[PDB]
Amino acid sequence: AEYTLPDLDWDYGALEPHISGQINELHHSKHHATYVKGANDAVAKLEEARAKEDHSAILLNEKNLAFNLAGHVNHTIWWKNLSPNGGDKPTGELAAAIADAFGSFDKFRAQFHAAATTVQGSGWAALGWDTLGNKLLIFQVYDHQTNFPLGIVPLLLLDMWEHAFYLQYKNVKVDFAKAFWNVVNWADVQSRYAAATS
Amino acid sequence: AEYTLPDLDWDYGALEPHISGQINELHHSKHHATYVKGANDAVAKLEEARAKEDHSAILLNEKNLAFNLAGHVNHTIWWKNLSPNGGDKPTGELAAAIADAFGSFDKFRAQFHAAATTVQGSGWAALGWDTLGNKLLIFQVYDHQTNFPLGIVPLLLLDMWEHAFYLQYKNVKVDFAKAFWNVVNWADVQSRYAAATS
Amino acid sequence: AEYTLPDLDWDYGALEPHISGQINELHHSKHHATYVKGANDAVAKLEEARAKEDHSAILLNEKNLAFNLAGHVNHTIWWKNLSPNGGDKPTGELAAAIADAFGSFDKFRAQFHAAATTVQGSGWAALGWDTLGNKLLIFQVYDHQTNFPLGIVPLLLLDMWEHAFYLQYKNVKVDFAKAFWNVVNWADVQSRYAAATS
Amino acid sequence: AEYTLPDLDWDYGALEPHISGQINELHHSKHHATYVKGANDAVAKLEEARAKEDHSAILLNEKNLAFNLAGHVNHTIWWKNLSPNGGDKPTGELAAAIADAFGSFDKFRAQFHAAATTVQGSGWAALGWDTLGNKLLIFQVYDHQTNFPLGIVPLLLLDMWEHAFYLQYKNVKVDFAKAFWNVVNWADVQSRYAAATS
Ligand SMILES: [Fe+3]
Ligand SMILES: [Fe+3]
Ligand SMILES: [Fe+3]
Ligand SMILES: [Fe+3]
């Protein structure tokens, strides 16, 4: 249906001291809400274009759709990938899947950390499942909608946009990327992997 | 396992005169095979990097992975989306789904056509299924890996890279985009749509 | 010689309250300095590649060079486009050129503002001289190095990367885009325009 | 005034057999012409936008402006960089400048070639003059307006868009990149170089 702003499963300051409540608030109620509106409007402008049978602005409408919808999609998984009861390491299948796919959980951690801290502009680090080769792969996302193939199922995202850590970490993006591991909700990622493999 | 070049379901000149056998031979045996090799190589360079604990070239590795795997994925669906006993219009769920999401089939076709012919460089037009919103949406893909969100399930793709139409239609790509409709394998799209909703 | 981090022609807090001294400090000593080190590194990397006759990482070296040199080029102009004893309005040559190119300073200001506040990720708003058509145009720059032609002479830049106003304005980027006009150094732009027309 | 399609300084088939007369007519008369009209169209919509005080499509107008203006700029220099009486090596200042900046003319050829043949989608190889560092550098241009800094003076360009060699070289882009050195108009590049360092 219409896109909507999801409700957080924890209080804004439940991730402190890893992630400030101040950022979580602005991030959620300001930033994320902006993409949900942008996604809904994009879908509405396209409805109109088809009705009036005028696609002179197709490029703009398609960019707005992809940008906002991807913005919305990314943030939705981001809030679920975070937990106050998080951290530690993944267990079972997922733990086994990550070890076979990246050699070790530490090697996986390293690659994810490097993809997240070397983005040139806004972006993300993403762990996803490739349906084609049936493999767990890490992708370096540019902005919200670029640098990955179609049909990839996202499992774990790390928001590398400046607004995700600036207020707190300032320019030191690697301290924020290291902190992230302390609030990862592996139960949600395990659930995602199980759904992707089935 | 390794990414592999899928075999075609028809002889090279099965789609004539809409699509030349000459283009299909080169397209398949040269272009597509090059992406498969690149995808496998990218995955191999990442294995090496993790083994050496050296991610100085993570940006390059991640770009080579996304570019080639996306090229491989895009072309694997392309070949299945085409059929000499194709053309017509979709039927069943797909027909109703398309009609109930774009107004009509013709309104869908007009938008797809507009997205396919206004790309500013290499790209594709794509019919995808959004899992968060549960909507059928059209996206305008730049290159192979850009301008769309994560989790989108591709249903129907239209390759708008110059090599896909140049030998036959030269600079008149809108003529190639029109001919495309005569060879679409709706049985394949219907099949992908059923799996995406199930 | 190597690229260098230029000195500010004013104290870090000279722009308050329009732009905080804390942002100016970080911006200058941390961000800008990073691009200078990155362009020098890219340049050296290419020297070594040429000496070793090995261009296996040509894509990465060209990307690192473009991104960091453009980051360095944009910030260098940005520092010079600001002044504590500036803002308000341009005169003589450019004042006439701007009204002729955009109808009025106010119409010019509105499009500049619109270009600055609608970027989809990190970017800039830029006023440049097109040598080919001998026209004054405004460009919407993506990141540091994208969305503009070769040969464009930059005259006035507005940094829209989140790190440019986040600490102070938070998510309200239009309030920062508006406060920018109070510190523009018209003399510097006026000077860049005569040289471009020369 | 308006942007115009420049006339070629030679007959369409004057570059044979290095570059077909067929590709030259299509390239010039069809492709280049579209970029000229697209740039003039973009400039007009922006005039209209300013008149109606409506910048709701500013992202689209700025992208169409950049893409087409860049398309037009790149091809104008392309026609001038080619010559039937071309080839050989650069002499005088330029020769010494290249050797000084790249080690040798052959080390320059190798880098330029690699940059040209590794583009992931549409792009160009370009030799430019960096006004800031006063350095001669090679950039790997994506599409027509991406992957290079502002203020860069283009000297020599190599069109790597598929429509530039497909009809004749098919998928073998490296054979076309090699053939290129046979029609390079060093008299033009030397002239551009003198103007840039002036
Ligand atoms: Fe975010
Ligand atoms: Fe293709
Ligand atoms: Fe900045
Ligand atoms: Fe071209």
UniProtKB/Swiss-Prot annotation, chains A, B, C, D:
Q: Where in the cell is it found?
A: Secreted
Q: What is its EC number?
A: 1.15.1.1
Q: Which PROSITE patterns match?
A: SOD_MN (PS00088)
Cofactor detail note = Binds 1 Fe cation per subunit.
**Is this entry keyworded Isomerase?**
no
GO CC term (a single one): extracellular region
Q: Which gene encodes it?
A: sodB
Signal peptide (from-to): none
Q: Which InterPro entries match?
A: Fe/Mn_Superoxide_Dismutase, Mn/Fe_SOD, Mn/Fe_SOD_BS, Mn/Fe_SOD_C, Mn/Fe_SOD_N, Mn/Fe_SOD_N_sf, SOD_C_sf
Keywords in alphabetical order, please: Iron, Metal-binding, Oxidoreductase, Secreted
Q: What does this protein do?
A: Destroys superoxide anion radicals which are normally produced within the cells and which are toxic to biological systems.
Instruction: Relate the assembly described in the record.
Output: Homotetramer.
Q: What is the official name of this protein in its record? A: Superoxide dismutase [Fe]
What reaction(s) does this enzyme catalyze? 2 superoxide + 2 H(+) = H2O2 + O2
The family note in this entry says: Belongs to the iron/manganese superoxide dismutase family.
Cofactors per UniProt? Fe cation
Q: What is the organism of origin for this protein?
A: Mycobacterium tuberculosis (strain CDC 1551 / Oshkosh)
Q: What GO molecular function terms would the record report?
A: metal ion binding; superoxide dismutase activity
Binding of Fe cation occurs at 27, 75, 159, 163
* Claim: Iron is one of the keywords in the record: yes
